[PDB]
Each structure stands twice: as C-alpha cells, then as structure tokens.
Amino acid sequence: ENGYTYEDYKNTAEWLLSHTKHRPQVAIICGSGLGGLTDKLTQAQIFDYSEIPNFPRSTVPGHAGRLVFGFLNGRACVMMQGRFHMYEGYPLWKVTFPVRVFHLLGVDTLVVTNAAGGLNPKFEVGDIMLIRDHINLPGFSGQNPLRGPNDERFGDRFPAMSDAYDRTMRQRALSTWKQMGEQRELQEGTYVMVAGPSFETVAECRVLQKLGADAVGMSTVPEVIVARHCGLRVFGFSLITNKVIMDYESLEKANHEEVLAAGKQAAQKLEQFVSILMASIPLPDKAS
Amino acid sequence: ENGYTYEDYKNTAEWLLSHTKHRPQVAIICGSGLGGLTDKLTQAQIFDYSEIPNFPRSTVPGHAGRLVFGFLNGRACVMMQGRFHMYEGYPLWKVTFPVRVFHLLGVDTLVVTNAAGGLNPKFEVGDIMLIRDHINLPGFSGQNPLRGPNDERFGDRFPAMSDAYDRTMRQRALSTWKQMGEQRELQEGTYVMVAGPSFETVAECRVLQKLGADAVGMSTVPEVIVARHCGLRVFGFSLITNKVIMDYESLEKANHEEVLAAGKQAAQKLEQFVSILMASIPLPDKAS
Amino acid sequence: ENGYTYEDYKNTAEWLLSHTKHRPQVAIICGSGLGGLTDKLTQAQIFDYSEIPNFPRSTVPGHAGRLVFGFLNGRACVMMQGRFHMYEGYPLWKVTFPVRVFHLLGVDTLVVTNAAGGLNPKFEVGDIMLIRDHINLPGFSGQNPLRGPNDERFGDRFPAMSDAYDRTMRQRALSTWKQMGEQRELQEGTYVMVAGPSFETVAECRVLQKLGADAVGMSTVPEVIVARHCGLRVFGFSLITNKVIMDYESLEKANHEEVLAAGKQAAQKLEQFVSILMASIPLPDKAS
Ligand SMILES: Nc1nc2c(ncn2[C@@H]2O[C@H](CO)[C@@H](O)[C@H]2O)c(=O)[nH]1
Ligand SMILES: Nc1nc2c(ncn2[C@@H]2O[C@H](CO)[C@@H](O)[C@H]2O)c(=O)[nH]1
Ligand SMILES: Nc1nc2c(ncn2[C@@H]2O[C@H](CO)[C@@H](O)[C@H]2O)c(=O)[nH]1
C-alpha cells in the first residue's frame, strides 16, 4: 500500500521483465543465513535491489542485497537474498513490495524462509520448522502490510489467512523430508513474527509460548500476507537458530551473532531441502 | 488528537449545528451491514462526510459514507453510516473524529455497532453480542485514539475504560431483548479489536480466545475510547457474522464477502433492537 | 534512531558536559510522583529539557520538565524529573533520547522508576516492585526504540534483553530493603509496558495477568531497551499506585488522579530507598 501506487509495481515488474529473459515461477525469500541458497542457481542473473526501480534499497546490510533469478532444480526462480524487515525501518509496504512485484513477474508460488528462536522446548537448535501457521503480533496492532486502500487488482480487502501456508506443500515436504531420509522429521509449528530489533526477555519468551507460537522471528509474516492477498501459493520454513530462554535459570543466550547455526550445514541442509522441493511445486504448465 | 486542533472539532460541530435544525442526543455508528438502520429515521437529514468540513471523507467504500440525523423511536439521533477503520489507513484520530464532533453536537450517548467473528464457540453465527468489555490490542502497542497531548476540554489524560460500556444499558437491553421475547437472550462478551484488513489465522484465532475475547472485530474500540473520554454514555452490540476457525480441521471460512448474515434479517433484527433501545436511553430532559 | 543522527547525541552530550562541571555516573529517571527524589541532591545543577539542545521539550506537563545533576548518597548523578512517554506523542526515539545522551555523558548505570498498576493480587497498593523483567507489548508490534538502522557506536543490531535488569542490583536491593529493615520485602515482578493514555479495562487487565505481567505501566521499557543497547547496567522499581480491577464486581478505580500513593511517603520511601542503593551501584573507580 501507501507510497507505492499500483503502477509503481507494474513499472518495476515490466522493467525487470525487460531486463532478465527469465520468467520466474517460484519466488524464494532467503532468510538470514540461507541466502547462500542462491549459489544453487543456473542461468542466475543478479539484480541489486538498488538497480531495480522502486525497489527498497538495502539499509546497513546491503551486502547480499540482490535479487537473483535463474533456476532451481527445474523451476524458473527468483531468489531474494537478504529480505527487508520492520526493524530496519522499512514501512511494511516496502518490506513486502517485492512480493507484489514477484506476482506481477508471473511468480505463482512463494517459498519464504527465516531464522527464528525456538519456543517449543522440543525444538533442538539446528532444526527446520515447516511453517504451518503464524501469529501476526505487529498486525494485531495495525502493522499489517495490507493496511490502506485495497487494490482489487491484487486482491480482496479482507483476504483470509486461515489457510496461509499451503497444506499440500506441507505434506509434499513432510514427506520429502522423509523420502530423502533425514532422521528427525522436519518439524512444524506456528511462527510468531515479533518486530523490534532486540531479542525476547524471558518474560516475553513465555507470553509467546503461551500465545501458542513455536518459533519467534522478525519477518516473513508480512510477506506471507501480501502473497496470500495476491493468490501466491505459499509455504516456508524456519531455521531454529537458537532456543529462546523460557527459564529464569537463564545464564545463556540466543543472540544473532551466535547465528552460527545459520552458517552451519544446517543452512546448507535447509538449502538443498528447499532445492528439492522445487520438484514438488505445481508447474503451472502441468502437462496433466 | 494530532492533525485536528480542538477548534477543528468546534468548527465542524457549529457548521453541522448550523446546517441541520436537528440537535442529536444519541450518536449511532452503524457497523457493517447494519447501516440500513438509517432507514428507520424520520426528519432524516443526510450529510455526506465529504460535505461536512474537516470530516474524514470515505475511502474506497464511500458508498454509504453519510451522516444521517433525524429521529429514532423518540430520540433525536445522528447515525453514522459506514464508520472509519484503521485498516483503511485513517490515523485513529480521524477514525474517532466523529465521536468528538458528536459530543460537541450535544450527543450524550453513543451506541456503537459492528460485525465481528465468533470466538466463543457457543456463539452461533447470526447472534448479537452486547459488548460488555473490550481488549484493545492495537492500543497496547500505542494505537490508542487518545495518544498525543490531552485536551482537558474533552477530558482527562488517563481516562478509565474499566467501565466503558454502560452497565445500565446492558441491563436495559438484556431485559429489552427479553421484554421483546426474542428466544435466544442477547449474548454478551468481550469484543477484541484487531486491525489489519486480513482475517485471523487459526493460530491467531486461538490467542484471541486465550486472551479472553469472545468476538473479534476491526473497529469500535477507538470510538468507545474517545467517547468515554468525553463522557458519552456508551453501549454497543456486535453482530457475530461468522465463527472464527479455532480448529485445524479448518476447511471452512468466515470471509467478509460471506457477510450474508450482515444482510440477513439478522441485520434487520439488530436494527429494530437498536431502535427499541432508544426508549431506554436516558432522556437528558428526564421530566423526573 | 530516526530523527536523531549519532552526532545529535554527541552535541547534546558535549553541550551538557560543557555546561555542568558534573560528570554523572548514575542516570535516574524519576517516575510519576517520585520526581521529588530530586530534592535529595547536592551540587544540584538544573537544566530544563527545553534549554538543552536536541532534548525533547516536555508537552503539557513541562512542570517538572528538568534534568537535575548533582549527587546522590555518594554518586555523581543526573536525574530526569518527568520522563517522556509514548502517549504524549513522542516517537520512541525521543522518549529514549535521554538515555543515549546519558551514556555519552559517561553514565554507566541507569535506575528507572515508574508508577504502575498492580496486576498481581498479592501486590498491596503502596508497594514497590523491583523490576525483574518486562513484557514489551508495544514492541511486539514494532514500537521498539531500536527500530531503524542500528548504530554500532551505541550497540548491536539485535541486543539481548533476556538479562535487562541487572541481577546484582536486584540482590543488592532485595538485601538493602532488608538491611534497612522495611517489613514487607521489596516485591518483584514483570513490568508490562502498555501505551495509550487510557487505563486498562477489566478485560485487558486479565490478558495482562495471563501474559504473566505483575505490574502495568506506560513507560520505562523503551528506556531499559536503549540503555541495555548501550551497555548501561540497569535496575528499576515500580511504585504500585493502585490495583488493576481484574474483577467484574468492579465498582472501584485505579485512575491517575488517585495517584495519592505517588504523593505519599510511599513516594518518599522509594526515594530514600533509591538514595540508599547509590552505595550499592559499582563505582567505575572500584579502588579494588
Ligand atoms: N524474535 C527472535 N528472532 C530470532 C531469534 N533467534 C533468531 N532470530 C531471527 O534471526 C535474526 C537474528 O539472529 C533475525 O532476523 C530474527 O528473525 C530469537 O530468539 N527471537
Ligand atoms: N477480525 C475479524 N473481523 C471480522 C470477522 N468477521 C467479521 N468481521 C468484521 O466484519 C467486516 C468484514 O466482514 C470487518 O469490518 C470486521 O470488523 C472475523 O472473523 N474476524
Ligand atoms: N497501564 C497502567 N498504568 C498505570 C496504572 N496505575 C498507574 N499507572 C502509571 O501511573 C501514571 C498514571 O497514574 C502513568 O504514567 C502510568 O504508567 C494502571 O492501573 N495501569
């Protein structure tokens, strides 16, 4: 919404279209540390957000602020390396701008990834949580990427998220994790977005558990929202990089610097995983 | 607050006063689908929000963006057909602007209506929930219509909502529902405002149940707030248009398009109901 | 963040430094009614926020909108009489501006006080709650004072609050309350910030209890956040001025006007208490 007019997206879509010979079918928003997933492409054509018209230029990070097209295990992709977040200051209509451009690029499916804390005790750091549902905390308070006048050309005023994360892909992945033979079945849980760049206190960590969330992160949710609004089929994972201290015995920490996990073959694992799933995303062509 | 100066309201109040021979006593903010309640007026004098100075012009809707004075079952009214919401983009000081003008129009009571999802399982779609209390989610995070410097001319800095919805009118309605002989007693529950124009996921639906809310909507609460701040006696209903999917068995939906209910004689029912209650609102005159 | 550039703080710090011969070590943000704590100073040098460059001038209050340096029981202090709040309209980067200046003034410890409602039933109005943890409600939704590009010169992008309130000072106070011989041990609980200037409904009062909070206030939390971000050791109290009506039997009220408590020797008590603790804050010098 606000700031971008429907034609802003059109222009950015057309430009891109007339700049990559590529027509993506799957948009992949690499979450922290899983940006390397880009390396798996072929016919990769890189675009710095900055070069792409209207696209939110990366803030301080920038490093890895590029939009990579090309192919992933037999899918015309378009990866977004380094997503945008609320805490960096981007109004949510900028955070999610890419999703709307993607859809206009033909993209009909969006796989969103992220690194998030483990709320569910059973989660072992290193895990990979297939997102089955989200609790949009900043949205309860108004921070919904859909706020503002709705453009019927993208979607309905009150779209429903009840079914955000595609159920099939959920199966097609619970199974793929298995068909691959990965030991600990890919987990599943409710991802709770939480903004602010700081990390949860033990007290916040427990309202999150209480509210029902299994993993705590600071993004994805706005992207899932404007994607669903457009119709994009959506499924995503969540690399549990750490265990949120639910205990006052405390004296430990899940800090980002300790991303490590998101540097481990953990990242690589979720990478190949995501690259396998490509085969399981419905090819618009079908061929029957 | 912000954007409107105390005299902005004064001007809009005076203009209105010097444009309708009507002096309202009850302001009625018709919620989605109960706007038809307008049809029950007499001496109805319509004002398009747009014509009224300083008044927030309706966004995309507009259709039914009018302020209707006149009378309801022996009360000098002023209905607002089509309220303003956070999701349309209106800063809450615009959403609630009307309530402050109303008070300056002499209005001493505000009946607020809305269409909201059913969180309490016992609620059957179609019901009518007398609002006994609200959980202001977007306010916990700052989105309170009272934020900004307080104008003692409207009220106190830290007004209390503990007692938002007038207890009498609650009786005077639990009973009127009965005195009328309506079968299923008018329900009662906590209305939880939730912004964002999208609908609740099954995961959000459950934190709402957990937090204690019985119905989930995207408005009213800011209006109740600035009304109480002014002193307006306040009572309101909530047409449970659908049942929020608290279950993962899911495969159903409460979407707005399926408003239906809010088109049914349900709307009409809550209408006549609201028109009866007019007799039960304390006439400033009294006559002892 | 936003609005203030790193050098804005530098300038305000230098100005102050070159205007008070004082070099504070402890910043004390007096909460409502405990501003009198100022009276306990020596070599007190007052600065009206207004006179200090870049400093957020007080809104309507103003009265008691001053920054008082000087000494408290053997500590070079700098008290802030009358803090800034979200409900007054200050963007959180203004609310917390002082904390960042303080740190640049050399301040290495911040004792934050506030007046807050009692959620935990056991709390008797009048009590004093040593803050052991906070639940940042407006932050869950984005209202974190750290939002925006992070300045590594103040701190890390994702600082951790798991350990906001210094554990030592917590002991050093649970004990000091005792070493002093005060009867009812100083309480302890989770402080939940909640913005909006209005007060909790019985329904909101219960989600707060449910979420785990013991006291409910409308500030502190942003200050604790940017303090921790800078490294400031932090501990704070909370004068339970009233009992939040968790009961529908209701017919009572905790309203600010009924601050009283915060006027009582209660305020004075928490004052001398805070002045004793000065001796227990680690002198940067140490002397071994
Ligand atoms: N809210 C939250 N986010 C986390 C946590 N651990 C990792 N993250 C995510 O990983 C990055 C920081 O490590 C951010 O972009 C967060 O989304 C955690 O414990 N809590
Ligand atoms: N948050 C929420 N609002 C609803 C629901 N059902 C109806 N509404 C309300 O009705 C309109 C959309 O149907 C909006 O103005 C909402 O206030 C529901 O399940 N959840
Ligand atoms: N949210 C909340 N704040 C309170 C309450 N009682 C006192 N306060 C605080 O005291 C002032 C008003 O009395 C505000 O600055 C609040 O932080 C209460 O019951 N709820």
Side-chain angles (χ1 to χ4, degrees), chain A residues 85 87 115-117 194 199-200 216-218 241-242 244 256, chain C residues 158:
Chain A
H85 304 75
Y87 62 70
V194 132
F199 283 17
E200 295 67 53
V216 49
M218 306 169 189
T241 39
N242 47 256
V244 305
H256 154 108
Chain C
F158 313 113

